[PDB]
Amino acid sequence: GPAHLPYGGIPTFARAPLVQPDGDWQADVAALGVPFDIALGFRPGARFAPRALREASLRSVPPFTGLDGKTRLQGVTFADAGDVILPSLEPQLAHDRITEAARQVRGRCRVPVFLGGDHSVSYPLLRAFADVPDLHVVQLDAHLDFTDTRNDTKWSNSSPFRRACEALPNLVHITTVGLRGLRFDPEAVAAARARGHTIIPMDDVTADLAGVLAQLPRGQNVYFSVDVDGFDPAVIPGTSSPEPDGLTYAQGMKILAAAAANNTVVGLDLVELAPNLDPTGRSELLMARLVMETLCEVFDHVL
Amino acid sequence: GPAHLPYGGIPTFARAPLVQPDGDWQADVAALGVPFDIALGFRPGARFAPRALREASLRSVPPFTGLDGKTRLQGVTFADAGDVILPSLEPQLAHDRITEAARQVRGRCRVPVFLGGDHSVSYPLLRAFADVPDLHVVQLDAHLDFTDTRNDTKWSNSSPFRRACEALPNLVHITTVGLRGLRFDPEAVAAARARGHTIIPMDDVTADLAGVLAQLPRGQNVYFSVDVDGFDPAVIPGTSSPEPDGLTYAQGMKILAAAAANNTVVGLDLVELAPNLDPTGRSELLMARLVMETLCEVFDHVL
Amino acid sequence: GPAHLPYGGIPTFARAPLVQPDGDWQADVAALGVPFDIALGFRPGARFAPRALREASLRSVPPFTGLDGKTRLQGVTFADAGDVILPSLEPQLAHDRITEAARQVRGRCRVPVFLGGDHSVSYPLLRAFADVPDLHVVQLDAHLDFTDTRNDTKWSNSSPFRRACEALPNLVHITTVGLRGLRFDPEAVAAARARGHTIIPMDDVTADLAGVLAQLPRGQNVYFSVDVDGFDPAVIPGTSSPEPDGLTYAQGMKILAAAAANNTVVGLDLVELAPNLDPTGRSELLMARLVMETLCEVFDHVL
Amino acid sequence: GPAHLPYGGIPTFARAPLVQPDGDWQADVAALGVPFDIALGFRPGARFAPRALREASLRSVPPFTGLDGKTRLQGVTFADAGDVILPSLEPQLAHDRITEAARQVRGRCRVPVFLGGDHSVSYPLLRAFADVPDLHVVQLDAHLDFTDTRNDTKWSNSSPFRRACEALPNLVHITTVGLRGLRFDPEAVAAARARGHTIIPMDDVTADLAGVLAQLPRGQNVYFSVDVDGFDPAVIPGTSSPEPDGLTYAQGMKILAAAAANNTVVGLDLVELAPNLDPTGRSELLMARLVMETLCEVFDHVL
Amino acid sequence: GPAHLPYGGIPTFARAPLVQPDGDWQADVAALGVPFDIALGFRPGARFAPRALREASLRSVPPFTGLDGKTRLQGVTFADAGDVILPSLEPQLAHDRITEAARQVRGRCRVPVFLGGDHSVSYPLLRAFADVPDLHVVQLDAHLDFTDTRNDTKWSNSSPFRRACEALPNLVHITTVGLRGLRFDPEAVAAARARGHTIIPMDDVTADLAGVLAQLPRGQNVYFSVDVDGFDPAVIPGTSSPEPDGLTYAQGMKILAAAAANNTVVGLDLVELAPNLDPTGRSELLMARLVMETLCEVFDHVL
Amino acid sequence: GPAHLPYGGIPTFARAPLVQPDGDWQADVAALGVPFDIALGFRPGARFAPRALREASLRSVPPFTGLDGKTRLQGVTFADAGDVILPSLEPQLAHDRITEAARQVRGRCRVPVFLGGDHSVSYPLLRAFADVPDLHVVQLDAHLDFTDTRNDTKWSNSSPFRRACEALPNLVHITTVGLRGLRFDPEAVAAARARGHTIIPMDDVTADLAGVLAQLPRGQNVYFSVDVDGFDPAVIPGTSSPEPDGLTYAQGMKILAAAAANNTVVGLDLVELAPNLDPTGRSELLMARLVMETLCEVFDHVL
Incomplete structure (x- = not known):
C-alpha cells in the first residue's frame, strides 16, 4: 500500500514498529536510544x-x-x-x-x-x-577514550572504554581506528598498549587501508562502537569536538563492512552526534545510513 | 515509575499511545497530522x-x-x-x-x-x-482565506473555507478573528458577508476585547481552526507569511477559552506553523501549549 | 494575466521596472539602494x-x-x-x-x-x-545619531544628522522619536536641544501617543528617516544595536501616518536593517511592508 | 585615549580587570561566572x-x-x-x-x-x-523552582530555592514574580505558601504593576535572582523552557529598580540564558544591559 | 566606469540585462528560472x-x-x-x-x-x-530519476527523465554519472538499461575517471542536467536528499568540460539546490560558478 | 589546581595571560588581534x-x-x-x-x-x-592579492602584498600557494612574476605536493600569511569568498610544517575567517588548531 514520505509519520528507527524494552517481542534488529x-x-x-x-x-x-x-x-x-x-x-x-x-x-x-x-x-x-x-570491540574514533580520570571524574566521555575494561574481564581486546589530534593521554595510551589493544592512527588508514583491514579481528565476537567524530568534520560536522582529516564515509564503511563479514557482530552504538551543530542536517542523514548500511553488511554474513 | 524528560522517548502528541486511523481503539482526544x-x-x-x-x-x-x-x-x-x-x-x-x-x-x-x-x-x-x-467555525487567522481562485488554482491555502462552505451546507457560520494586513480579497469579503459570516479585524480585539468575545457563538457546535499567523510574529515567527500587530498568546487563548466554555467543540486544527522559520523553537513550544490549554478549557466545561 | 508568487521573478522593489538613476524615466515613486x-x-x-x-x-x-x-x-x-x-x-x-x-x-x-x-x-x-x-526631518530611531565625532571619525553612523545639518543650512528642524538606552552622547543631546530639535523618548510614546503626534510638524516639507532599531527588538530583531522596549509596528506606523497626513513628504529612507541577524525573516518582511504602507498614507494625503 | 568597539578586546564583564576569586583585590562590583x-x-x-x-x-x-x-x-x-x-x-x-x-x-x-x-x-x-x-530573595521567574525531587534528583534547576531554604534558616522569605504556565508542582506550591513565600503570578503584574511593586520587600537584605525565562519569549527567546506572556524588559526592570530603591541589595544572579537558542543575539545583549541597569539602580540608593 | 560589488545591484544571472522570454532580444547565453x-x-x-x-x-x-x-x-x-x-x-x-x-x-x-x-x-x-x-543527455546525479511512478504520482522529481523519454522519441540516449546510495528502483534501472542508457556509478568515477570520460558522447547534440546532489554533501550540502561520497567540484567539472569540448551543447539545467539547507552559502556560490565555468568550456569549443 | 573546560574561563589565546602591547612583559609567543x-x-x-x-x-x-x-x-x-x-x-x-x-x-x-x-x-x-x-612571505591563499587598485581603492583586501612590497624594499620574495578560481588580475600576476614571486596554483599541490614543498624557501626569514580561503570550503566554509577544490587541513599544514622546519619564522597572520558564516563552528576550531600546530613545528626545529 501507500507509504509515508520521510517527513511523514511517527519517527521510529528504520520506521520499525514501536515496542517496550521489556515487552513481548522479538526482531532481528532492535534500536535503543x-x-x-x-x-x-x-x-x-x-x-x-x-x-x-x-x-x-x-x-x-x-x-x-x-x-x-x-x-x-x-x-x-x-x-x-x-x-x-x-x-x-x-x-x-x-x-x-x-x-x-x-x-x-x-x-x-x-x-x-x-x-x-x-x-x-x-x-x-x-x-x-x-x-x-572473548569480547572484542572495533572502535571508530578520533580519540582513544581510554582515560582514567579527567576534570575530576571517572565518568566523562573520555573514559568509557577504560571503565568497561576494568568492569568486564571478558572484554579482552579493543581495536581503535581513526585516531588523530595534537593531544593524546600518555597514561591512557600506555594502559591500552599494556592490555594489548590495537591502536590504528588515521595516518595508517590514509597510507594503507588494506593493511588496516588486515589488522581487524577475525572469527571473534565483536561489538561496534562508532563515534561520529571519527569521520572527517567536512563530512560529519555535527559533533562536539571535531578533529581535521578524518575518515570519509567510504573509509569508515569499508572498515565496518570488513569486520562485519569476518566476525560475529553482537551489537553496535553510534555516539557523539550533535544535530544542533549541523544545520544542514547531513550529519544525521549520513550517520543514519551508516548504521543501516552496516546492518546490511552484518546480515549478509550471518552464520 | 520514572518519566521521560522532554528530549526523551518517541515523539507522539502529548506522549500518547500510537494508533492507526482505522484501527481498533477509542479515546477522548485523538491527534492526526x-x-x-x-x-x-x-x-x-x-x-x-x-x-x-x-x-x-x-x-x-x-x-x-x-x-x-x-x-x-x-x-x-x-x-x-x-x-x-x-x-x-x-x-x-x-x-x-x-x-x-x-x-x-x-x-x-x-x-x-x-x-x-x-x-x-x-x-x-x-x-x-x-x-x-448547524456547524460553526471559530477561526483565528490573519487572513480571511475565503478566496475562490488564486494563482490559477481552487486548492490554495487561501481558499479552504470557501471550498468547505460550497461542499458542506451544514457549515452555517464562521467567525474569523485577527484579520489584518494591507490586502484583502474584495470578492472573498463580499462572499463571506453575503453568507452572514462574522469578520473581526485585529483592530477590534485591540480596541475592545470584551466586545469581541460577545460576538462568539454560544451553545453551538464549534470547530476550531487556528492559523498560527493570527498571532503576532514577535510571538510566533515560525510561519510562512507573518503580518505585524497580531494576537498575543493571551488574547488568542482568551478567545479560544471563551468559545470552548460556551459551546460543544467538535474538533480543532492548528495550521501554518513553520518550525524551520523559527530557530529559537518558541513557535512550536507555544502552539503545542496552545492546543493543550484549549483542551483544558474544552474538558473543563463538559455537559 | 498570471502573476508571480513572492518567490518568483527578479526582485525589484515592489516589482517595479528597473531604471538607471540618470536615465530617461519618470515615476511617482522611485527606490534607490x-x-x-x-x-x-x-x-x-x-x-x-x-x-x-x-x-x-x-x-x-x-x-x-x-x-x-x-x-x-x-x-x-x-x-x-x-x-x-x-x-x-x-x-x-x-x-x-x-x-x-x-x-x-x-x-x-x-x-x-x-x-x-x-x-x-x-x-x-x-x-x-x-x-x-525649511527642510524638516522626522526620525524614528532608538538613537539620536547627532554626534560630532565617534571612534576618531566624522562619518560613523552615529553622526549622519550632525553632518547633514552642517552641510545643509536649509535643514532647520529634526523631530526624533523612540529614543531609549543607557547611554547618550551628552554633547549631541545638548546640541540638538540648543538647535531647537525635538527629542521624544520612547517613554513619552508609551505614556501618551496622542501628545506625541501633537508634537509632529505641520505644513512642512518632511523627509522621513526610519532606523529599524526604533522598533522593539522582539518585533524587528534584525539590526546591529537593538535596545529593549521600542515601538510596535503599529505605533511607528501611526507616527508616520500622522506626519504624512499633515505635511509635504519629500522622501524616505529605511536604514540599519540587518537581514543576517534575523533568520526568521520577519524583520525584512515587516519593514518592506512599513515602506509600502507609509507610501499608501503619503499618496492618500498629498496636495 | 581611544576606546574599543564592542567587537574589540578581550571580553571581561564590563571590560573590568581580571582577578582571582581569592586574590588580593577589592572592587564595588565583581562578576563571577x-x-x-x-x-x-x-x-x-x-x-x-x-x-x-x-x-x-x-x-x-x-x-x-x-x-x-x-x-x-x-x-x-x-x-x-x-x-x-x-x-x-x-x-x-x-x-x-x-x-x-x-x-x-x-x-x-x-x-x-x-x-x-x-x-x-x-x-x-x-x-x-x-x-x-533575615535574607530575602526577589526572584524573577516563569517557574517557582521550589520542587523537592524531580526526575530522581534533588539537584535539578527546578529545586534550587527548595535546597536553599532547607539549608539556610536565615533565608526567611522569597518573593517570586512572573510565574505562569500550565504545569505546576502541587507539592512545591504548597510547601512555598506554607513557608510564607510571596507568589506573584504574571497575571498580577499585567493587571496592576503598581500593586506588584507594593508587594516587594522594604528595608530588607535582598538577593536578586533573575531567570531570563521570566521575560516574555518574544523579548528573550534564548532560554531552555520559555512560557508565553512574560515580562517585558521594562516591567522586569521596574520590579528590580523598585526593590533596589527600598532594600539593601546583597547580590544578584542572572541565570538560564541560552545564547545558542537565539541567533539574533538580542537575548544576551538585553540581559547584559539588564544587569548593568540594575547596578545603576542599586548604586543610586546606597546607604 | 566603476562596477558593483557582489552585494550591489539587482541580482540577474551573470549581472545580465533583464528581458522577457518572448521579447525582442538576442544573446549568446540566456538564463531562465x-x-x-x-x-x-x-x-x-x-x-x-x-x-x-x-x-x-x-x-x-x-x-x-x-x-x-x-x-x-x-x-x-x-x-x-x-x-x-x-x-x-x-x-x-x-x-x-x-x-x-x-x-x-x-x-x-x-x-x-x-x-x-x-x-x-x-x-x-x-x-x-x-x-x-538524436538528443543526448549528460546527467550528473546521485539518483537515476528514471522512475515511472512514485508516491502515487507520475510528476515527482524521481521521474523527470522517464517522462521526457516517453514524450520525446528524439531523446535517443542518456549518460548518468555519479549514481550511488542504498536504494535503487529496479523497475527504473531496467527501463534505462533497456533503452540502452549508460549508467555510471560514482564508484566508477573514483575507480577510473578517464574511463568514464571515454564513455561520454562525441559529436552529438547534448543537454546537460546537473543535479547538485550529484556532488559530495561535504562540498554541496544545500540539497534535499544528500548521499555520501559524491563528486568533488573538480570531478563534476571535468566531466562537463570533456563533453563540452567535442559536442554541440544545446542547453543545461542546474537543479535541486536548496539554499535554505546551507547557511554557509557555499552551495549556491559553487554551483553558480559551475554554470559559468561550464559556459567557458562550451564557448571555447564552438564550431 | 583543577583546569577549566573549553567553555570555562576568559577566552584569551591558548588561555595565555593578558598583556598590553607596550607593557613590561616578554614571551616566546604573543597573540595580537x-x-x-x-x-x-x-x-x-x-x-x-x-x-x-x-x-x-x-x-x-x-x-x-x-x-x-x-x-x-x-x-x-x-x-x-x-x-x-x-x-x-x-x-x-x-x-x-x-x-x-x-x-x-x-x-x-x-x-x-x-x-x-x-x-x-x-x-x-x-x-x-x-x-x-631579505624578508620572505609564504602565503596560503586562493587568491594572489597583489592587486594595485580595486573598486577605486588601494587598501582593499585584494592589495595587501602589493602595498607591502612598495613600502618594504626588504620584502624580497613571496611564495603563494593554493591559487585557484576563474578570475585573476592580469596586471597583478604580471607584476608578481616581474618581481620573481613564486605562484603555486592548487593544481600543482594536488598533482605533486612533494614538489610544492621543494619550492618553499630554505634558510630565510619567513613571515607566514594564512588566508583561510586557501583551504577547501568543505573543510573551512567560514570565509567571505570561498573557492572550490582547495587545500585539505593536512595539505596546508604540511606546507607550513615544511617551511617552519627550514626557516626562521618571524611571524604569522591568520586572516579572513568568518565565524558567522559557519554555524557548525568547525572553521574556527580547525584554524585555531592550525595556528597551534604551526607553532609546535616552529619551536620543535628552531635554530
Missing part, C-alpha cells in the same frame, strides 16, 4: 541525537535493492525499543538504567543498535555484554 | 509542523495542576493516529485521504486534533464534519 | 538590506485594496533605480556617489525611497535635498 | 551564557550618562573574577566550588554579580549568604 | 534556488581572465529572461508554462541555462527540445 | 574572527604530547596582547595603529601571531617587519 550528554566536556547536543537519527532513518527504510538488483536485509525484522528513561544528573543511576535497558533489548533481538548520547554511554552499554566470551 | 504544505504561496516548511508540534508537546504532557491546586484533563485519554499518508503532488488525492482519515479518527474519539500542514488542509478536514448540524 | 554598512560600530549586515527589502517587497506589491474595499496607491507608478555603485572603503567617494545618485533619482520622481545601508547613508542622501526650503 | 548547565531538564546551552553575557556587556560599559544628562555608576569600580572551575559531572563538587568561589568574591566587593548557568546554581550561590540576617 | 519545488519528496527549498543562484552569480560575472592570461567568454553576450510564471499546485499547467517559456528563450539565444527548482522541471524543460535530432 | 573587516568586498564577519579564534584555542592549550609520546611546545610561554584599538572607518589611521601595535608586540616576543581580520591587515602588519633582511 540513550539521550545522555552531560558527560561531554565541550559542546552539548548529543542528547537530541537519538531523535535526529530516527528522523533521518526514514530516508533509509529497509530492505534495500542496489543497482545490481541484489536485495539486502530482505526479511530482516526491526524494532524500536524507544529510549532509556534517564534521570537528571545522577550519572550512576543513569548508568544503571542504561545497562538494564540494554540487557532487555539484547535478549529480544539478534543485533541491538544503541543510539547515543555522548561516548560515556558506551560503558553502561557494554556492561550488558559480560557473558560474551 | 497532515504534513501537507505544497498549497501555500510563499515559504514552505509546514509539512514538518506535525512532527515539531509532537516534540514540543512533550513539554506539555497532561494532566495539569495550576497554581490554584486545581487539576485539569484528569482522566482524559489521548491517542495519536499518526499522519495521513499523502502522495507527492496529486492534491485531489491528498484531500480524499485527509477526509477519510479525519472521518475514521473522529468516529473513534470525542475531540479530534488536526496538525497541519498549510491552511488548505482545513477543507478536506472539514468534509469529515458533514453530519454536524 | 545604498548597500553601505562599513560605518556602523557593531554588527555588519546592513549592506544586504537593500536586496532583502526588495525580495520582501514582493509580498507587498501595490496597489492595495483593504477590508473596507477601498484601494490605495491606485495608478501610482513605481520604478527601481537600482543601487548606488559603491567603491570599497573610500567613504568620502561613496558619499559623493550617493548624493549624486539621490539627486538624479529625486529629479525623476515625486517621492524617492532610499534603502540602506547603515544610518550614515542618511547624510549623503540628505545632501540631495539642499533646495528644499 | 558559573558555566554549569547539566542540571536543566530540556535544552542545554546556558553553560555558554557567562561568556555571551561578558561579550554583550561590551555594549554596556559603565559609567552611563543618560538622556537627562545625569551619570550613573560614576567612580564605581568593577572586577571580573572569571569562572568557577567546574568539574565534569560531579554535581556535589561543582556545588562546593561554586559556594567557595562565591564567598571569596562576596567578601571582596560590595555587590557580587553571578552569571549562570542553569538555575540550579542559585542553590550553591545562596549558601555563601548564610550569614545574612 | 523555474522556482518550482512541490514535486520533491523530502526537504523543500529549491524554489528559492533560482534567486540564490542569481545572487551567487554576481561573484562570477564574465568574461574571465585566467592565471595564464587567456580570457574566456570574451564578447559572449548574456541575458536573463526572469522566471516562468508558475501557478500554485496545478503541476500540469506549470509544465506547459515551463515548456513554452523554455522554447521562447531557446529561440532567442544559442545556449539556454535553466535554473531549478526540483528535478521534476527537467521534464517540461526537455519538451522544449523536441525538435532536436 | 586585528578585528578589521571593512576592506573586504563581499561578506563581512572577519571582525569577529579574533574572538572566535581565542575561544576555539581553548581546545588546544599547550603543551602537546602526541600519540608517539613526544611532547611539543614544552617551555614555550604565551601572552595575549589583546586587540589593536581600531577607529571606525579611517583606514589610514587603522593601518598606523596596526603597525604600531605589531611593532610593540614583535619587540616583546619571539614569534608574534596576528589574528585577522580581512586580508588587508597583512599590509600594516608587514610594515612592522621592515628591519628583517
Whole structure:
C-alpha cells in the first residue's frame, strides 16, 4: 500500500514498529536510544541525537535493492525499543538504567543498535555484554577514550572504554581506528598498549587501508562502537569536538563492512552526534545510513 | 515509575499511545497530522509542523495542576493516529485521504486534533464534519482565506473555507478573528458577508476585547481552526507569511477559552506553523501549549 | 494575466521596472539602494538590506485594496533605480556617489525611497535635498545619531544628522522619536536641544501617543528617516544595536501616518536593517511592508 | 585615549580587570561566572551564557550618562573574577566550588554579580549568604523552582530555592514574580505558601504593576535572582523552557529598580540564558544591559 | 566606469540585462528560472534556488581572465529572461508554462541555462527540445530519476527523465554519472538499461575517471542536467536528499568540460539546490560558478 | 589546581595571560588581534574572527604530547596582547595603529601571531617587519592579492602584498600557494612574476605536493600569511569568498610544517575567517588548531 514520505509519520528507527524494552517481542534488529550528554566536556547536543537519527532513518527504510538488483536485509525484522528513561544528573543511576535497558533489548533481538548520547554511554552499554566470551570491540574514533580520570571524574566521555575494561574481564581486546589530534593521554595510551589493544592512527588508514583491514579481528565476537567524530568534520560536522582529516564515509564503511563479514557482530552504538551543530542536517542523514548500511553488511554474513 | 524528560522517548502528541486511523481503539482526544504544505504561496516548511508540534508537546504532557491546586484533563485519554499518508503532488488525492482519515479518527474519539500542514488542509478536514448540524467555525487567522481562485488554482491555502462552505451546507457560520494586513480579497469579503459570516479585524480585539468575545457563538457546535499567523510574529515567527500587530498568546487563548466554555467543540486544527522559520523553537513550544490549554478549557466545561 | 508568487521573478522593489538613476524615466515613486554598512560600530549586515527589502517587497506589491474595499496607491507608478555603485572603503567617494545618485533619482520622481545601508547613508542622501526650503526631518530611531565625532571619525553612523545639518543650512528642524538606552552622547543631546530639535523618548510614546503626534510638524516639507532599531527588538530583531522596549509596528506606523497626513513628504529612507541577524525573516518582511504602507498614507494625503 | 568597539578586546564583564576569586583585590562590583548547565531538564546551552553575557556587556560599559544628562555608576569600580572551575559531572563538587568561589568574591566587593548557568546554581550561590540576617530573595521567574525531587534528583534547576531554604534558616522569605504556565508542582506550591513565600503570578503584574511593586520587600537584605525565562519569549527567546506572556524588559526592570530603591541589595544572579537558542543575539545583549541597569539602580540608593 | 560589488545591484544571472522570454532580444547565453519545488519528496527549498543562484552569480560575472592570461567568454553576450510564471499546485499547467517559456528563450539565444527548482522541471524543460535530432543527455546525479511512478504520482522529481523519454522519441540516449546510495528502483534501472542508457556509478568515477570520460558522447547534440546532489554533501550540502561520497567540484567539472569540448551543447539545467539547507552559502556560490565555468568550456569549443 | 573546560574561563589565546602591547612583559609567543573587516568586498564577519579564534584555542592549550609520546611546545610561554584599538572607518589611521601595535608586540616576543581580520591587515602588519633582511612571505591563499587598485581603492583586501612590497624594499620574495578560481588580475600576476614571486596554483599541490614543498624557501626569514580561503570550503566554509577544490587541513599544514622546519619564522597572520558564516563552528576550531600546530613545528626545529 501507500507509504509515508520521510517527513511523514511517527519517527521510529528504520520506521520499525514501536515496542517496550521489556515487552513481548522479538526482531532481528532492535534500536535503543540513550539521550545522555552531560558527560561531554565541550559542546552539548548529543542528547537530541537519538531523535535526529530516527528522523533521518526514514530516508533509509529497509530492505534495500542496489543497482545490481541484489536485495539486502530482505526479511530482516526491526524494532524500536524507544529510549532509556534517564534521570537528571545522577550519572550512576543513569548508568544503571542504561545497562538494564540494554540487557532487555539484547535478549529480544539478534543485533541491538544503541543510539547515543555522548561516548560515556558506551560503558553502561557494554556492561550488558559480560557473558560474551572473548569480547572484542572495533572502535571508530578520533580519540582513544581510554582515560582514567579527567576534570575530576571517572565518568566523562573520555573514559568509557577504560571503565568497561576494568568492569568486564571478558572484554579482552579493543581495536581503535581513526585516531588523530595534537593531544593524546600518555597514561591512557600506555594502559591500552599494556592490555594489548590495537591502536590504528588515521595516518595508517590514509597510507594503507588494506593493511588496516588486515589488522581487524577475525572469527571473534565483536561489538561496534562508532563515534561520529571519527569521520572527517567536512563530512560529519555535527559533533562536539571535531578533529581535521578524518575518515570519509567510504573509509569508515569499508572498515565496518570488513569486520562485519569476518566476525560475529553482537551489537553496535553510534555516539557523539550533535544535530544542533549541523544545520544542514547531513550529519544525521549520513550517520543514519551508516548504521543501516552496516546492518546490511552484518546480515549478509550471518552464520 | 520514572518519566521521560522532554528530549526523551518517541515523539507522539502529548506522549500518547500510537494508533492507526482505522484501527481498533477509542479515546477522548485523538491527534492526526497532515504534513501537507505544497498549497501555500510563499515559504514552505509546514509539512514538518506535525512532527515539531509532537516534540514540543512533550513539554506539555497532561494532566495539569495550576497554581490554584486545581487539576485539569484528569482522566482524559489521548491517542495519536499518526499522519495521513499523502502522495507527492496529486492534491485531489491528498484531500480524499485527509477526509477519510479525519472521518475514521473522529468516529473513534470525542475531540479530534488536526496538525497541519498549510491552511488548505482545513477543507478536506472539514468534509469529515458533514453530519454536524448547524456547524460553526471559530477561526483565528490573519487572513480571511475565503478566496475562490488564486494563482490559477481552487486548492490554495487561501481558499479552504470557501471550498468547505460550497461542499458542506451544514457549515452555517464562521467567525474569523485577527484579520489584518494591507490586502484583502474584495470578492472573498463580499462572499463571506453575503453568507452572514462574522469578520473581526485585529483592530477590534485591540480596541475592545470584551466586545469581541460577545460576538462568539454560544451553545453551538464549534470547530476550531487556528492559523498560527493570527498571532503576532514577535510571538510566533515560525510561519510562512507573518503580518505585524497580531494576537498575543493571551488574547488568542482568551478567545479560544471563551468559545470552548460556551459551546460543544467538535474538533480543532492548528495550521501554518513553520518550525524551520523559527530557530529559537518558541513557535512550536507555544502552539503545542496552545492546543493543550484549549483542551483544558474544552474538558473543563463538559455537559 | 498570471502573476508571480513572492518567490518568483527578479526582485525589484515592489516589482517595479528597473531604471538607471540618470536615465530617461519618470515615476511617482522611485527606490534607490545604498548597500553601505562599513560605518556602523557593531554588527555588519546592513549592506544586504537593500536586496532583502526588495525580495520582501514582493509580498507587498501595490496597489492595495483593504477590508473596507477601498484601494490605495491606485495608478501610482513605481520604478527601481537600482543601487548606488559603491567603491570599497573610500567613504568620502561613496558619499559623493550617493548624493549624486539621490539627486538624479529625486529629479525623476515625486517621492524617492532610499534603502540602506547603515544610518550614515542618511547624510549623503540628505545632501540631495539642499533646495528644499525649511527642510524638516522626522526620525524614528532608538538613537539620536547627532554626534560630532565617534571612534576618531566624522562619518560613523552615529553622526549622519550632525553632518547633514552642517552641510545643509536649509535643514532647520529634526523631530526624533523612540529614543531609549543607557547611554547618550551628552554633547549631541545638548546640541540638538540648543538647535531647537525635538527629542521624544520612547517613554513619552508609551505614556501618551496622542501628545506625541501633537508634537509632529505641520505644513512642512518632511523627509522621513526610519532606523529599524526604533522598533522593539522582539518585533524587528534584525539590526546591529537593538535596545529593549521600542515601538510596535503599529505605533511607528501611526507616527508616520500622522506626519504624512499633515505635511509635504519629500522622501524616505529605511536604514540599519540587518537581514543576517534575523533568520526568521520577519524583520525584512515587516519593514518592506512599513515602506509600502507609509507610501499608501503619503499618496492618500498629498496636495 | 581611544576606546574599543564592542567587537574589540578581550571580553571581561564590563571590560573590568581580571582577578582571582581569592586574590588580593577589592572592587564595588565583581562578576563571577558559573558555566554549569547539566542540571536543566530540556535544552542545554546556558553553560555558554557567562561568556555571551561578558561579550554583550561590551555594549554596556559603565559609567552611563543618560538622556537627562545625569551619570550613573560614576567612580564605581568593577572586577571580573572569571569562572568557577567546574568539574565534569560531579554535581556535589561543582556545588562546593561554586559556594567557595562565591564567598571569596562576596567578601571582596560590595555587590557580587553571578552569571549562570542553569538555575540550579542559585542553590550553591545562596549558601555563601548564610550569614545574612533575615535574607530575602526577589526572584524573577516563569517557574517557582521550589520542587523537592524531580526526575530522581534533588539537584535539578527546578529545586534550587527548595535546597536553599532547607539549608539556610536565615533565608526567611522569597518573593517570586512572573510565574505562569500550565504545569505546576502541587507539592512545591504548597510547601512555598506554607513557608510564607510571596507568589506573584504574571497575571498580577499585567493587571496592576503598581500593586506588584507594593508587594516587594522594604528595608530588607535582598538577593536578586533573575531567570531570563521570566521575560516574555518574544523579548528573550534564548532560554531552555520559555512560557508565553512574560515580562517585558521594562516591567522586569521596574520590579528590580523598585526593590533596589527600598532594600539593601546583597547580590544578584542572572541565570538560564541560552545564547545558542537565539541567533539574533538580542537575548544576551538585553540581559547584559539588564544587569548593568540594575547596578545603576542599586548604586543610586546606597546607604 | 566603476562596477558593483557582489552585494550591489539587482541580482540577474551573470549581472545580465533583464528581458522577457518572448521579447525582442538576442544573446549568446540566456538564463531562465523555474522556482518550482512541490514535486520533491523530502526537504523543500529549491524554489528559492533560482534567486540564490542569481545572487551567487554576481561573484562570477564574465568574461574571465585566467592565471595564464587567456580570457574566456570574451564578447559572449548574456541575458536573463526572469522566471516562468508558475501557478500554485496545478503541476500540469506549470509544465506547459515551463515548456513554452523554455522554447521562447531557446529561440532567442544559442545556449539556454535553466535554473531549478526540483528535478521534476527537467521534464517540461526537455519538451522544449523536441525538435532536436538524436538528443543526448549528460546527467550528473546521485539518483537515476528514471522512475515511472512514485508516491502515487507520475510528476515527482524521481521521474523527470522517464517522462521526457516517453514524450520525446528524439531523446535517443542518456549518460548518468555519479549514481550511488542504498536504494535503487529496479523497475527504473531496467527501463534505462533497456533503452540502452549508460549508467555510471560514482564508484566508477573514483575507480577510473578517464574511463568514464571515454564513455561520454562525441559529436552529438547534448543537454546537460546537473543535479547538485550529484556532488559530495561535504562540498554541496544545500540539497534535499544528500548521499555520501559524491563528486568533488573538480570531478563534476571535468566531466562537463570533456563533453563540452567535442559536442554541440544545446542547453543545461542546474537543479535541486536548496539554499535554505546551507547557511554557509557555499552551495549556491559553487554551483553558480559551475554554470559559468561550464559556459567557458562550451564557448571555447564552438564550431 | 583543577583546569577549566573549553567553555570555562576568559577566552584569551591558548588561555595565555593578558598583556598590553607596550607593557613590561616578554614571551616566546604573543597573540595580537586585528578585528578589521571593512576592506573586504563581499561578506563581512572577519571582525569577529579574533574572538572566535581565542575561544576555539581553548581546545588546544599547550603543551602537546602526541600519540608517539613526544611532547611539543614544552617551555614555550604565551601572552595575549589583546586587540589593536581600531577607529571606525579611517583606514589610514587603522593601518598606523596596526603597525604600531605589531611593532610593540614583535619587540616583546619571539614569534608574534596576528589574528585577522580581512586580508588587508597583512599590509600594516608587514610594515612592522621592515628591519628583517631579505624578508620572505609564504602565503596560503586562493587568491594572489597583489592587486594595485580595486573598486577605486588601494587598501582593499585584494592589495595587501602589493602595498607591502612598495613600502618594504626588504620584502624580497613571496611564495603563494593554493591559487585557484576563474578570475585573476592580469596586471597583478604580471607584476608578481616581474618581481620573481613564486605562484603555486592548487593544481600543482594536488598533482605533486612533494614538489610544492621543494619550492618553499630554505634558510630565510619567513613571515607566514594564512588566508583561510586557501583551504577547501568543505573543510573551512567560514570565509567571505570561498573557492572550490582547495587545500585539505593536512595539505596546508604540511606546507607550513615544511617551511617552519627550514626557516626562521618571524611571524604569522591568520586572516579572513568568518565565524558567522559557519554555524557548525568547525572553521574556527580547525584554524585555531592550525595556528597551534604551526607553532609546535616552529619551536620543535628552531635554530
